Design a protein around this ligand. Structure first.
Ligand SMILES: *Cc1c(COP(=O)(O)O)cnc(C)c1O
Ligand SMILES: *Cc1c(COP(=O)(O)O)cnc(C)c1O
Ligand SMILES: [Li+]
Ligand SMILES: [Li+]
Ligand SMILES: [Li+]
Ligand SMILES: [Li+]
Lengths: 421, 421
């Protein structure tokens, strides 16, 4: 991640310390220019379609749209978010694509009404759509028979994945397409390769194979998402030119087979927004538990789910309350944990739950911690566990911080239950 | 769990099938009498203090209060919930206890204002409270040096737990108590033993030891929570008389040492509400993925977190759309998964993420699935991941189903971001 004393971005030490006083704490902060930088790295692609489930604030969606980035919505709620951000299906039919493995009644009505292209990930879903919206423009999400990672575990592909039409179910999908006169716009895969370029090549190769074998005309293909970001010091960052080389080559083979140009979409979620965001949280309690040195803050896993749920790594920095530099202060092996009355609420833990320590300056109550690289799957995954309200979100742009989401209140949550007082 | 064809409770087959049509789907359903039954099993205890983080709907809190059950709140939001349910600190000072390892400014002001007893789980927190509210009535949550489960992992006790004042920090806690003239009401432990009665005996024994060694007068002790429920067919249920025997014996030794009666609280969360609740979700897509038979429903891990996050088991039943019995229908090994565009959204998975199958009738789109025993840590843990709104909650009481929480809307979530339109 970025050092707080780099000062190329707006995510610096003086900048971060003042934010909690102005906007409240804990608080999510994003740097608009870092997002613009990630968008520019994918300029070779015809279409960059942001996977909004990674970070859905409508002001961040508006920023995407301003940069010519389109959007993928995976729920009816995400469709409404896109519309609130100025995406318009009537003037621009491909600006929003609705993508999922299932579709419910309200969504069917909404995508029929607005003629939002649907990327169906089950033949059943394709049939349900077709019956109520004959001739709808569709994409097919294909499961090519393999995913990424352990073959036994939940996956984005392969037989232990709920995602997409199994490749040998394609003929059955074509029957559904023909029955309802569906218009095939494109074929999509979302598997994710990180910086495993050999794995990426297998995805590209399966796309070429499957599209050519399916034998239908289409206007576009999508590489899906899954570009990784280096959460830990020294890890390798994605080479977008390399991604483009491999996916362009697959697109070109398909286009050659079809006899006309085929548009190439890429659908990043994490890559665009992860590094742009931080989470600022105050230290509230510091104590020794046996041989462990614990530092408890006011943000918990209901806020940032990753570490507690998956053992994910987020870099952690410390900010002294009075602003003195802790740059070169001595470090102590620290266990960082939250305020929830819940055993799993520990930020420094490995996959599977083992507690671990992080080398941090010796902070006191009143000091702040910064969790780095929380722009993706941070606020987007938040819950209200322990009756804790969604946090405020702040957007930095050229040194200026502005509120883009206010703190939810307990009253707003209670209004759901107070049905006539 | 209960069979849907038992029909001793209101959670039967005909009853469940009609609920989604009336109230929407997916939907949480609770049976009031099952909660009353769990409350009655702990009648020996002086105080049953419901851990509301397990299930916080204010109508369910009102039901608790009607049964003479008190409440533990672990956040400012939970305090407000308790007040909305008719608990009153002014007339009854011990009806709400605020319990946590940290305390923030807004909470300090609220508990000072209302004189809500605070159960402090860090000396720092005890000091912060004392400074602004001298003479406050307090409890001390003690970490006795050990928890429950693997010694390396996040825990409710032991050195790999963020919870409670480490037992050798007790003398330092007493200095804080004396400095601010705090009034010690009681001493508490929340470790959790399930049906491991030998482990329970170690907790009881540590309580006696620690209280006597601390050498302070107090009015009460608390056994904390952690009573288990049998989620799987054949598992052993808690013997409350056994729990009482062991904790009463510890209370009696303490009382004998103090020279006066000592009140005994028990603080169950799961035990009171788990078995009372179900989650009803419609089947939307059925497909074969390689060798796996997948059934995707309209509820996902944002709704019920347990299986996806921890590999937790919830019994699953099937309901045919037209109401024909599936009681004795042949079963097929099924992978049950949700609607999220997220690989981990699979209900039939083991701890660590391995996909597994469940023997279920061969349902089609339009049929419903019932996830059993979701009363605890179901709605309470829900998130808005994938911009999905909090579900509706329905309460059954003597055959009558009533709405106790309406479905959240996307507009309510968007209002947080629309700051002047
Ligand atoms: C989540 C998701 C993405 C983005 O995945 P990342 O790893 O964040 O890039 C892209 N497409 C679909 C259909 C998704 O569900
Ligand atoms: C969660 C919690 C409980 C209840 O735990 P269960 O396992 O649901 O019984 C009791 N006390 C405190 C302080 C808690 O955090
Ligand atoms: Li897998
Ligand atoms: Li929240
Ligand atoms: Li442990
Ligand atoms: Li939700």
């Amino acid at each position: 991640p970025h050092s707080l004393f780099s000062t190329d971005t707006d995510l610096t030490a003086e900048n971060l310390l003042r934010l909690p006083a102005e906007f409240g704490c804990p608080v999510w902060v994003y740097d608009a220019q870092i997002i613009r930088r990630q968008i520019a790295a994918l300029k070779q692609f015809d279409v960059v379609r942001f996977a909004q489930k990674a970070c859905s604030n409508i002001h961040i969606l508006r920023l995407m749209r301003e940069q010519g980035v389109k959007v993928d919505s995976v729920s009816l709620g995400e469709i409404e978010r896109a519309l609130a951000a100025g995406y318009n299906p009537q003037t621009h039919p491909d600006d929003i694509v609705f993508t999922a493995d299932v579709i419910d009644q309200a969504t069917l009505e909404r995508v029929s009404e607005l003629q939002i292209p649907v990327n169906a990930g089950s033949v059943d879903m394709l049939d349900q759509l077709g019956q109520v919206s004959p001739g709808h423009r569709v994409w097919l999400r294909v499961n090519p028979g393999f995913g990424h990672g352990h073959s036994q575990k939940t996956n984005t592909g392969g037989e232990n994945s709920k995602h997409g039409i199994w490749y040998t179910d394609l003929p059955a999908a074509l029957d559904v397409i023909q029955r309802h006169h569906l218009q095939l716009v494109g074929i999509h895969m979302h598997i994710g390769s990180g910086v495993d370029y050999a794995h990426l090549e297998q995805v590209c190769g399966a796309m070429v194979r499957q599209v050519i074998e399916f034998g239908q005309d289409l206007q576009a293909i999508s590489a899906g998402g899954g570009l990784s970001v280096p959460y830990q010091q020294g890890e390798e960052a994605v080479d977008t030119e390399h991604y483009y080389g491999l996916w362009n080559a697959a697109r070109e083979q398909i286009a050659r087979h079809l006899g006309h140009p085929v548009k190439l979409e890429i659908e990043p979620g994490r890559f665009l927004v992860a590094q742009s965001g931080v989470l600022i949280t105050q230290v509230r309690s510091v104590k020794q538990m046996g041989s462990r040195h614990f530092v408890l803050v006011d943000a918990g896993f209901n806020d940032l789910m990753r570490p507690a749920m998956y053992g994910s790594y987020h870099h952690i920095s410390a900010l002294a309350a009075d602003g003195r530099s802790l740059e070169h202060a001595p470090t102590v092996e620290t266990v960082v944990a939250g305020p929830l009355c819940e055993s799993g609420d520990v930020f420094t833990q490995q996959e599977g739950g083992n507690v671990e320590t992080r080398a941090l300056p010796e902070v006191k109550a009143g000091d702040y911690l910064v969790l780095h690289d929380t722009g993706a799957y941070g606020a987007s995954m938040s819950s209200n566990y322990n009756s804790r309200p969604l946090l405020p979100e702040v957007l930095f742009d050229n040194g200026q911080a502005r509120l883009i989401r206010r703190r939810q209140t307990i009253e707003e949550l209670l209004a759901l239950e107070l049905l006539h007082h």
